[PDB]
Design a protein around this ligand. Structure first.
Ligand SMILES: [Mg+2]
Ligand SMILES: [Mg+2]
Ligand SMILES: [Mg+2]
Ligand SMILES: [Mg+2]
Ligand SMILES: [Mg+2]
Ligand SMILES: [Mg+2]
Ligand SMILES: [Mg+2]
Ligand SMILES: [Mg+2]
Ligand SMILES: [Mg+2]
Ligand SMILES: [Mg+2]
Ligand SMILES: [Mg+2]
Ligand SMILES: [Mg+2]
Ligand SMILES: [Mg+2]
Ligand SMILES: [Mg+2]
Ligand SMILES: [Mg+2]
Ligand SMILES: [Mg+2]
Ligand SMILES: [Mg+2]
Ligand SMILES: [Mg+2]
Ligand SMILES: [Mg+2]
Ligand SMILES: [Mg+2]
Ligand SMILES: [Mg+2]
Ligand SMILES: [Mg+2]
Ligand SMILES: [Mg+2]
Ligand SMILES: [Mg+2]
Ligand SMILES: [Mg+2]
Ligand SMILES: [Mg+2]
Ligand SMILES: [Mg+2]
Ligand SMILES: [Mg+2]
Ligand SMILES: [Mg+2]
Ligand SMILES: [Mg+2]
Ligand SMILES: [Mg+2]
Ligand SMILES: [Mg+2]
Ligand SMILES: [Mg+2]
Ligand SMILES: [Mg+2]
Ligand SMILES: [Mg+2]
Ligand SMILES: [Mg+2]
Ligand SMILES: [Mg+2]
Ligand SMILES: [Mg+2]
Ligand SMILES: [Mg+2]
Ligand SMILES: [Mg+2]
Ligand SMILES: [Mg+2]
Ligand SMILES: [Mg+2]
Ligand SMILES: [Mg+2]
Ligand SMILES: [Mg+2]
Ligand SMILES: [Mg+2]
Ligand SMILES: [Mg+2]
Ligand SMILES: [Mg+2]
Ligand SMILES: [Mg+2]
Ligand SMILES: [Mg+2]
Ligand SMILES: [Mg+2]
Ligand SMILES: [Mg+2]
Ligand SMILES: [Mg+2]
Ligand SMILES: [Mg+2]
Ligand SMILES: [Mg+2]
Ligand SMILES: [Mg+2]
Ligand SMILES: [Mg+2]
Ligand SMILES: [Mg+2]
Ligand SMILES: [Mg+2]
Ligand SMILES: [Mg+2]
Ligand SMILES: [Mg+2]
Ligand SMILES: [Mg+2]
Ligand SMILES: [Mg+2]
Ligand SMILES: [Mg+2]
Ligand SMILES: [Mg+2]
Ligand SMILES: [Mg+2]
Ligand SMILES: [Mg+2]
Ligand SMILES: [Mg+2]
Ligand SMILES: [Mg+2]
Ligand SMILES: [Mg+2]
Ligand SMILES: [Mg+2]
Ligand SMILES: [Mg+2]
Ligand SMILES: [Mg+2]
Ligand SMILES: [Mg+2]
Ligand SMILES: [Mg+2]
Ligand SMILES: [Mg+2]
Ligand SMILES: [Mg+2]
Ligand SMILES: [Mg+2]
Ligand SMILES: [Mg+2]
Ligand SMILES: [Mg+2]
Lengths: 206, 126, 148, 193
RNA sequence: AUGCCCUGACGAGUAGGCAGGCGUGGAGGUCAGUGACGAAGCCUAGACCGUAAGGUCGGGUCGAACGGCCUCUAGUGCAGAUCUUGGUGGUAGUAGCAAAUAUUCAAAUGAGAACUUUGAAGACUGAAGUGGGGAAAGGUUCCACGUCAACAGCAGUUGGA
RNA sequence: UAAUGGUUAUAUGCCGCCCGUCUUGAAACACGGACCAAGGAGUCUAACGUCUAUGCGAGUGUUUGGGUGUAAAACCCAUACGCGUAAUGAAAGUGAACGUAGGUUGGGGCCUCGCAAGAGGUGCACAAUCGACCGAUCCUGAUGUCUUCGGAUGGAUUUG
RNA sequence: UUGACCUCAAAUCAGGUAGGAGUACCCGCUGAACUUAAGCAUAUCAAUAAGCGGAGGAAAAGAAACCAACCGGGAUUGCCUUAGUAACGGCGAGUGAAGCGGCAAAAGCUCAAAUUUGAAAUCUGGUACCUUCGGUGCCCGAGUUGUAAUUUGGAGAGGGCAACUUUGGGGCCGUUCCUUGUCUAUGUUCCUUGGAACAGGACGUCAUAGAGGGUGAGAAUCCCGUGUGGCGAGGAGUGCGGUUCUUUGUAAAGUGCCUUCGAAGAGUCGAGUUGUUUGGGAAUGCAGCUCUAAGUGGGUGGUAAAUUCCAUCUAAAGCUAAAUAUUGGCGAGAGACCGAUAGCGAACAAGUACAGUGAUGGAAAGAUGAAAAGAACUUUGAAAAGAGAGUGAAAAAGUACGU
C-alpha cells in the first residue's frame, strides 16, 4: 500500500503533451536528444499517407531510410548493450536507443510493418504518448508524420479557428511573445529609453 | 516480439524449462542443421539428430572433422561423434562432447520415421 | 523522494536532529489527545476553544437531503442564462418576452440578494427567495415565481 | 500528544487495520475482464441487446426530484397500457417491476410512449422459423435515452400581480405552524355552551 | 548572464536549523560510451585533482561484464548499540593432562611399540568381586577379515573407531 | 637533474591523556569497546497545517465507472460527487450596496508642472481608525388580521 | 383360533448415506488479555486473537412486514459518495452507521391450502424388457392424519357469455469452447583477436519473427522458439442447415366483459425483565425467563406515553445466476522487488540434520573447468605426500577447487 501510481491533472498532462509535440519541431532539441537528423531536409518531417498502408517490414525500412531516418535507424542496433547491473536478470537484459517515432492517422499495416524494427515506435494522433514524445523527460523526439496525421493535428489539439475536439480544451497561452529577449532588448524603442552602458569589466581604481 | 499471452519471456522460467527438459523434449532441442547438399536434396533446414547420422563439425577446435555419431547423450545436452575423441594421458580415448547446433548433418540415417518426418516438414525425399 | 529529506543530512551526527538531552522516546505526552483537560490545556484553550462540552439539541436520524438549499446570489443570477444568449437579453431589455431562469434546474434552492442585477426584467423560478432578493428582481421589472 | 496550532484529526487506525487493507491493484485487470465478459455475453445473447429497457421514473427526495433517471421496471399498468402482458414483456427485453405504482400521469405517459417506441424499433424473430440475422446493437440505453422533460419555455411575459412571493413563503410557513392551534381554538370555541 | 567583473566588510561554537556538494543499489534518456587486445572486484609507504566527502591514473592479480552526464527512485553511507552472524588474536606452547597401590624383562608383528600380541615376572579386585548372569535402556555396540585420515584430551600396529 | 619539490620511513626540538556517551563537570578509580568482515537504526501509510512549484481559475478535480489500446501504460468521456463561490444561530429560521461598494490617515507605482528639488492630482496591495450591510442577542412595535397572527420602521464596542 | 391397525424392535436383510482432510476466502457459535485512556474500574483494544461447529467455487444475502415523506423510489451484492457525518462516549481517550445520488451486474420466483370427489389422477422399490444420467409393463408398498393437477397476494378462484393467438421432442456432421498434436523466414560468407567467435571489421538476407533461451565470450539470420497462418485428434447439458416423432392434435397457455369470492405461516408477533450487543440516544439486534395476541389488522415511520389521522409494506414458510471475497489448491503471465548473513526457515537429500519425555523448536550448507581433459609415467618416502612430468587458455582453476 505504498503509493505506486501517481495522479497528474489532465490539463497539465495535456500541457506537457502539447509542449512535447512543439519540441519535435525545430531541430536544436532534436539533435540535443540524440536523434541523428542533420541530413534531414526539414523538420517536421511529413511523409505521404501511403506509408500508413505499407504492410511489409522490408518496404517500411526502405521508406524511412529514403526520407532520411537511416542514420537514426543505424543509431539503434549499434547501441545494443548489456544492462549494467542486477536488472539484466530481471527480464531487462538489453539497452538500446530510441529511434524515430512514426505518427499516423489510420493503421492499415504500418504498425505491424514497423513492429520488428529496433527503436522505431508508432503512434496514433489521437493518443500521442508523452513517454514516446519526450523519452527520459527529454524534449525533442524525432517524429515522422504522415500527411493524414499532420492534417489531423489541428483537429486533435485545436487552432485559433478550430476548437479542440477535446471538451473545453484550448492550447495554452504564452506569457512572453517571443523566446528571444535580445531582439526586444536591442529594439529601437527600448534602446532609446536606456542610458549608455559601462565598460563591462570595471577598471580597478586604487 | 511476443504477442501471445501463454508464451513467456521470463529468463528464470525459460532456463528452468531448458535445464529440466525430459528426454523426448531434449530431442528437438538437440537439432542440427543440414548440409548444402541435403537442404538442396530434401528441402528441410534442420533435423532432430539421431545416432547413426554422419556429421561435419563446423565450429570449435574440432572444426572440419567428419564422423558418425556414436551417441546422442541427452543428459549432458551433447552428442559424441566417433573419431572425434580426446586422448587421455594414460593412453585412453574419451569422446568429446559436441553440441549439435555446431554440427552439420552430412548424411541422414533413414528409416520410415525419418522419411515420414521429412514429408511432414514439406520435404522432397529424393 | 528519499534523497531530499533531512534523514540523509543527519547521517554521521549522533542524535538525528532530536537532541541528546531530550533523547527521542516513544510517547512523552501520551498518545493522541491525552490530557487535553490536564496537561495540554494551554494548547486546548488557545487554538481550540470550545472543544470540551456540549452544544444544543441532538437530531436523531438526520438526513442532509432535507436541508438541501444551495444559495444563488443576484451578483450572479445571469450566468445561468448561457453566454451566447445572454447579450441579446441584456440589450433589448424588455418585458413581454423576458428570460426564464429555472433556478432549481440549475440546482439552487434559495435566491439571495448580494447585489446589482441589471435593469432587465427576468422571470425567476426559485424555490425560495429572500426579502431583498425579491425586491431587487422586481425593481428591475422582473418577477419571482415560486415552484416546488 | 497535543501540539501546535493544527486541526484535530480523527484518524481511525487503532484496530488491526493492516490485515484489512484492500489495495486495488486489479483495477486495470478487472476492467479487461469486465470488457471480456460483455463481449462474451453479447456473443452468447446474440442479437439481443445486452440490457433490458428500463423505465423513466422521477427521482425521490426533494434534493433530487428535479431529475428523472432510469428506473427498475415498467409498472404493470404501463405494460398493460402499452398493449402487452408482463410475462411477454419480460421475454422481449422489457424490464417489469411489480412493486412500483403510478401516481404521475406525466411519468406514466412518458413510459407508455417509451414502451410503444421500443416495440416499433425492435424486430422479434420467429420462435422456430428461418430468422435471418439482424445486426446486434449492444445497448438499449443509447437507443432509448432518458431525456429530461422541459420545465418552461426560454422566454415569457412578466406577470407580476403584487402577491410579493416572500410574504407567500412567510404566510405559508405560518399556516403550517399554527394549523392545529387554530382548529383547536375553533373547536374550543364550539365546545363552549 | 544561479555567467564575467569591480568594491567593502566578515569568518569561534554543543543541542539545533538550513544550504551547496560527495558516494551506493535500481529506473527513463543519452555518450552510435568502455570491454576477452581483458569488464567488475582486489592489492599497491607509485602518480595526479578536490578544503573535504571523494574523484582520477599507473603497476600487480583477475576473468565477463561495466561506466560518464541529464533526470527518477530508495531496504542508500557505521567505530561504537555488554548490537547480530561468521571469522580471528594476545593470554600461550601457558594452566594443565596428579582419585581408583604398579608395573617390569624378552621375543614377535611393524615404517614406527611406555601402551599391540605371546611368554616370563610382580601385583590387585578378594565371592555384598574389577567374577558369572539378567531387568530397564541401548540397538549391532556381538564375531571375523581388512584398515588407521578423523575419534580413543599422550601414543596406537590396538579398539565399543 | 632527483638539484628544488612531492610521498614515505627515521631522527631531532617543542607540543600532543581514549574514543563514543550521559553529565554542571570525564583521562578518570563513571558506562560501552580484544580485533576484523558483512549486516545494522526517522521508514511507509491515512488524515491534515505552513510554505513553495505547476495547471486551470469562480471554479476545480479525466483514472468509481465507461470508451479505447501497440494492453496493469497511453489516449478519450457522460452523469454525479467532493471541495470552493454565504454566513449566522442551540433551533425554527433568516440571510450580505445609503453612497462612485463609504469617510479619515499613511501608502508604492502612474499622471501634470518642474533644471533638479519639490508641488499637485490619482492612489492597487497593505496598516490604523470611524461608519454601512447579513445573522444571532437585547430593545421599539406600523399598515393590516377572522385579534392573534404578522413584523414595517428606528435603535447598540453587544455578538460572529 | 384368525385377520388387520397403531406404536416399538431385530437382522452380516435390499439399496444408500454421515464421519476425516484442507480451511486463503465464506456462515455461525464462543471469547480474551496485553494496549490506549499519560493512573484506572466504564470504555478502548474488540463484537478482535485463541477455541468449536458447517459449506462451496465462491459462500452469504436476495425478490420488501424495504427506503422514504419526494413530482416519490423499488430484490440482493459490491465500488465511488454520503462521511470521519447523524449519533454513541468518565460527551474523556476514543468510536461511528444509513437513506438519497453515480456506477458494476441484473432475474426472477415457490409452498401453506381450496373437495379430483364422476377416478390418488401422485411416488419409492423389486422384477422383466429396451434405445440405460433413463423409458415401458407387471407386482408389492407409501399415501386419504393428503401424494398429483390448480393458486401464491404483482394476485388469483368458481360460474356465465363475442373472441383471437401461441402447440412440444430426439440423434447427426460441419458451426462455440476446452485440451492437444503437427507444419509454417533469413549467413553459420571472408579478414583479425581468441582455447572457443557468439567479439571486431567487410559484404548480405529475413522481419505480421530484433520476446526469450541454448550453443566453448554480447547470435534476428547455428538450434529451439518467436510472429502469422494452415491442417488435424479427443472431449463441452449447444447458438445454427437438414433430420425424425407427424390425429405429437378440440392437450396446454395468454387475453375481453359480467358475477360471486378471495382462504394468506401462534408460545409467533408484541410486552416486561435479564444479559449481551449497537452509532441507535425513555432501549439497534439477539438470546434466556415471564405474559401472550388480532383479522378494513399486523409491522414500520430513529423522544417515552395518551388521542386523532396519514403513509408504506404484508412477518412468524421456501428457492435463486451475475457484479463481490480469496496469504489454500491447480494452471499461467508479470515486476523500477531480493540476490546466498539478502530473499520464504529452507536456491542445496529442508521442516532436512539435530535438541527435547512431550507439546514444540530448528540450522549450516550455492560457484573447478568450454569440456575431467580429475594429473599417465619417473623419482624420494612406510605412507600421506613431495619433486619432476603432463592436461588445460589458465593449476596465480588440483574436487581443501571462480575472484
Ligand atoms: Mg554493480
Ligand atoms: Mg550538530
Ligand atoms: Mg540520544
Ligand atoms: Mg490535575
Ligand atoms: Mg426530503
Ligand atoms: Mg408509492
Ligand atoms: Mg408516482
Ligand atoms: Mg562557523
Ligand atoms: Mg560541498
Ligand atoms: Mg545509480
Ligand atoms: Mg565497444
Ligand atoms: Mg581489470
Ligand atoms: Mg596498505
Ligand atoms: Mg568465467
Ligand atoms: Mg539500512
Ligand atoms: Mg562513523
Ligand atoms: Mg562493523
Ligand atoms: Mg557514532
Ligand atoms: Mg561474535
Ligand atoms: Mg583464543
Ligand atoms: Mg605445563
Ligand atoms: Mg608431573
Ligand atoms: Mg585392599
Ligand atoms: Mg589382595
Ligand atoms: Mg581386528
Ligand atoms: Mg590421542
Ligand atoms: Mg595419532
Ligand atoms: Mg569387539
Ligand atoms: Mg641526476
Ligand atoms: Mg629525475
Ligand atoms: Mg628536498
Ligand atoms: Mg607535553
Ligand atoms: Mg549538557
Ligand atoms: Mg569521554
Ligand atoms: Mg576500542
Ligand atoms: Mg570492557
Ligand atoms: Mg562486542
Ligand atoms: Mg557495512
Ligand atoms: Mg451590525
Ligand atoms: Mg445585524
Ligand atoms: Mg445390507
Ligand atoms: Mg469468514
Ligand atoms: Mg461468518
Ligand atoms: Mg486510542
Ligand atoms: Mg493508559
Ligand atoms: Mg488515566
Ligand atoms: Mg498501570
Ligand atoms: Mg466491542
Ligand atoms: Mg478464529
Ligand atoms: Mg470442494
Ligand atoms: Mg463469481
Ligand atoms: Mg446460495
Ligand atoms: Mg412477495
Ligand atoms: Mg434496493
Ligand atoms: Mg463530506
Ligand atoms: Mg465498536
Ligand atoms: Mg452499526
Ligand atoms: Mg451491467
Ligand atoms: Mg393457470
Ligand atoms: Mg560476427
Ligand atoms: Mg552467451
Ligand atoms: Mg525470429
Ligand atoms: Mg538473446
Ligand atoms: Mg498469415
Ligand atoms: Mg405470511
Ligand atoms: Mg457473545
Ligand atoms: Mg459495546
Ligand atoms: Mg438462501
Ligand atoms: Mg494461494
Ligand atoms: Mg557472497
Ligand atoms: Mg537464507
Ligand atoms: Mg527426545
Ligand atoms: Mg564460492
Ligand atoms: Mg565445451
Ligand atoms: Mg605433485
Ligand atoms: Mg586466469
Ligand atoms: Mg598442477
Ligand atoms: Mg589467483
Ligand atoms: Mg583463477
Amino acid at each position: 500500500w505504498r503509493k505506486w501510481n501517481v495522479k497528474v491533472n489532465h490539463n497539465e498532462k495535456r500541457y506537457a503533451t502539447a509542449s512535447a509535440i512543439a519540441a519535435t519541431a525545430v531541430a536544436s532539441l532534436v539533435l540535443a536528444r540524440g536523434h541523428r537528423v542533420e541530413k534531414i531536409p526539414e523538420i517536421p518531417l511529413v511523409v505521404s499517407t501511403d506509408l500508413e498502408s505499407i504492410q511489409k517490414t522490408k518496404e517500411a525500412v526502405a521508406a524511412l531510410k529514403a526520407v532520411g531516418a537511416h542514420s537514426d535507424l543505424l543509431k539503434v542496433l549499434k547501441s545494443k548493450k548489456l544492462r549494467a547491473g542486477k536488472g539484466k536478470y530481471r527480464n531487462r537484459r538489453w539497452t538500446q536507443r530510441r529511434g524515430p517515432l512514426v505518427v499516423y492517422a489510420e493503421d492499415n499495416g504500418i504498425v505491424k510493418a514497423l513492429r520488428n524494427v529496433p527503436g522505431v515506435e508508432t503512434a496514433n494522433v489521437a493518443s500521442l504518448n508523452l513517454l514516446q514524445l519526450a523519452p527520459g523527460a527529454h524534449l525533442g523526439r524525432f517524429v515522422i508524420w504522415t500527411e493524414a496525421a499532420f492534417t489531423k493535428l489541428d483537429q486533435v489539439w485545436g487552432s485559433e479557428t478550430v476548437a479542440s475536439s477535446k471538451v473545453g480544451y484550448t492550447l495554452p497561452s504564452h506569457i512572453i511573445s517571443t523566446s528571444d529577449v535580445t531582439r526586444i532588448i536591442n529594439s529601437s524603442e527600448i534602446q532609446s529609453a536606456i542610458r549608455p552602458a559601462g565598460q563591462a569589466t570595471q577598471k580597478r581604481t586604487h | 516480439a511476443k504477442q501471445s499471452l501463454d508464451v513467456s519471456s521470463d529468463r528464470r522460467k525459460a532456463r528452468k524449462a531448458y535445464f529440466t527438459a525430459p528426454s523426448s523434449q531434449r530431442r528437438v532441442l538437440l537439432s542440427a542443421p543440414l548440409s548444402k547438399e541435403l537442404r538442396a536434396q530434401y528441402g528441410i533446414k534442420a533435423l532432430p539428430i539421431r545416432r547413426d547420422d554422419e556429421v561435419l563439425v563446423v565450429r570449435g577446435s574440432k572444426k572440419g572433422q567428419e564422423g558418425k555419431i556414436s551417441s546422442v547423450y541427452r543428459l549432458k545436452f551433447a552428442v559424441q561423434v566417433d573419431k572425434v575423441t580426446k586422448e587421455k594421458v594414460n593412453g585412453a580415448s574419451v569422446p568429446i562432447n559436441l553440441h549439435p547446433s555446431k554440427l552439420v548433418i552430412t548424411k541422414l540415417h533413414l528409416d520410415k520415421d525419418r522419411k515420414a518426418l521429412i514429408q511432414r516438414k514439406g520435404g522432397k525425399l529424393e | 523522494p528519499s534523497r531530499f529529506t533531512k534523514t540523509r543530512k543527519h547521517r554521521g551526527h549522533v542524535s538525528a536532529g532530536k537532541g541528546r538531552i531530550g533523547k527521542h522516546r516513544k510517547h512523552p505526552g501520551g498518545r493522541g489527545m491525552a490530557g487535553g483537560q490536564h496537561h495540554h490545556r494551554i494548547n486546548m484553550d488557545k487554538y481550540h476553544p470550545g472543544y470540551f462540552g456540549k452544544v444544543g439539541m441532538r437530531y436523531f436520524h438526520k438526513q442532509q437531503a432535507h436541508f438541501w438549499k444551495p444559495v444563488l446570489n443576484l451578483d450572479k443570477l445571469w450566468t445561468l442564462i448561457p453566454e451566447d444568449k445572454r447579450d441579446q437579453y441584456l440589450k433589448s431589455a424588455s418585458k413581454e418576452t423576458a428570460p426564464v431562469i429555472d433556478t432549481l434546474a440549475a440546482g439552487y434552492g434559495k435566491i439571495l440578494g448580494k447585489g446589482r442585477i441589471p435593469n432587465v426584467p427576468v422571470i425567476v423560478k426559485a424555490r425560495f427567495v429572500s426579502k431583498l432578493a425579491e425586491e431587487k428582481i422586481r425593481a428591475a421589472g422582473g418577477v419571482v415565481e415560486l415552484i416546488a | 500528544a497535543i501540539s501546535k496550532n493544527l486541526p484535530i484529526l480523527k484518524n481511525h487506525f487503532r484496530k488491526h487495520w493492516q490485515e484489512r487493507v484492500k489495495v486495488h491493484f486489479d483495477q486495470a485487470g478487472k476492467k479487461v475482464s469486465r470488457r471480456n465478459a460483455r463481449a462474451t455475453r453479447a456473443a452468447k445473447i446474440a442479437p439481443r441487446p445486452l440490457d433490458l429497457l428500463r423505465p423513466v421514473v422521477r427521482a425521490p427526495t426533494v434534493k433530487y426530484n428535479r431529475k428523472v433517471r432510469a428506473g427498475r421496471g415498467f409498472t404493470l399498468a404501463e405494460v398493460k397500457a402499452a398493449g402487452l402482458t408482463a410475462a411477454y414483456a419480460r421475454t422481449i427485453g422489457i424490464a417489469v417491476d411489480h412493486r412500483r405504482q403510478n401516481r404521475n400521469q406525466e411519468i406514466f405517459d412518458a413510459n407508455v410512449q417509451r414502451l410503444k417506441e421500443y416495440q416499433s424499433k425492435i424486430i422479434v424473430f420467429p420462435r422456430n422459423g428461418k430468422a435471418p440475422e439482424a445486426e446486434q446493437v449492444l445497448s438499449a440505453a443509447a437507443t432509448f435515452p432518458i431525456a429530461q422533460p422541459a420545465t418552461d419555455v426560454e422566454a415569457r411575459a412578466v406577470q407580476d400581480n403584487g402577491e410579493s412571493a416572500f410574504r407567500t413563503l412567510r404566510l405559508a410557513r405560518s399556516e403550517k405552524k399554527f394549523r392545529g392551534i387554530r382548529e383547536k381554538r375553533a373547536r374550543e370555541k364550539a365546545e363552549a355552551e
